[PDB]
């Protein structure tokens, strides 16, 4: 935390809250399209002042946590897909953004 800085830490926390909030919004809307589109260019924004591996680990952690509370196979797989879209977009932007 100390080397990362307060401003970057605020950005990281609000971004985790952001991922969770669009997961909720996508579940309500019925399509994960907002997550997909807002993640199809996020990696190159993040790389210089962020760790993409750290972000992928964080999104996997939220996926596991949210899957924990559901206690239903279909709900678990649906939320897992809505987090897999984040992971997949981050992995797809290994080269530049489309």
């Amino acid at each position: 935390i100390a080397v990362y800085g307060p401003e970057r830490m605020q950005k990281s926390l609000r971004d985790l809250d952001w991922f969770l909030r669009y997961v909720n919004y996508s579940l309500v809307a019925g399509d994960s399209n907002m997550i997909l589109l807002n993640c199809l260019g996020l990696r190159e924004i993040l790389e210089k002042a962020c760790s993409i591996d750290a972000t992928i680990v964080a999104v996997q952690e939220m996926r596991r946590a949210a899957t924990g509370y559901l206690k239903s196979n279909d709900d678990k797989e649906l939320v897992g897909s809505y987090f897999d879209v984040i992971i997949r977009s981050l992995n797809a932007d290994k080269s530049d953004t489309p």
């Binding site: 797809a92 290994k94 080269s95 530049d96």
Partner: protein, 160 residues
């Protein structure tokens, strides 16, 4: 090339070459000898340029040859250096042609989605071509260096 673009532009309006177009072709053919000098000097020292281009690329971005990187492995690093060789050869072709249309037709159109299929990071490509530009402009004189570096900056912008 300059002649080809001028001919295409004239053919677009179904007309002859304009006095300005004849002048631009005249300027191109007048300085062709210096372009040949530049291309010959770049070609003669290709293996150096490639080797230390890889050197600054890998020292500036150790993660590429770090485990999990795109360039890890002898074969994958060899393909890295071969891509650098391709682009140096394309730059020499552009020097000869007097414009960047060989770079366009060979190695720019569709480069992004190709390196998307290859997982190849485009910032890594930009750093590699910038190292190539620094070295090549270093071997050449400043008057040459400016026009040689313009093609490399073009390639870097295309990859970026």
């Amino acid at each position: 090339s300059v002649v080809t673009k001028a001919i295409v532009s004239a053919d677009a309006e179904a007309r002859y070459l304009s006095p300005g177009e004849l002048d631009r072709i005249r300027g191109f053919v007048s300085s062709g000898e210096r372009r040949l000098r530049v291309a010959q000097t770049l070609t003669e020292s290709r293996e150096r340029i490639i080797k230390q281009a890889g050197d600054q690329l890998f020292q500036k971005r150790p993660d590429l040859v770090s485990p999990g990187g795109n360039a890890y492995g002898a074969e994958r690093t060899a393909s890295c250096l071969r891509d650098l060789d391709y682009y140096l050869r394309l730059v020499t072709f552009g020097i000869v042609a007097g414009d960047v249309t060989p770079i366009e037709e060979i190695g720019v159109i569709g480069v992004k989605e190709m390196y998307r299929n290859l997982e190849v990071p485009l910032p890594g490509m930009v750093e590699a071509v910038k190292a190539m530009k620094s070295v090549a402009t270093g071997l050449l004189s400043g008057d040459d260096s400016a026009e040689v570096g313009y093609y490399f900056d073009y390639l870097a912008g295309a990859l970026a």
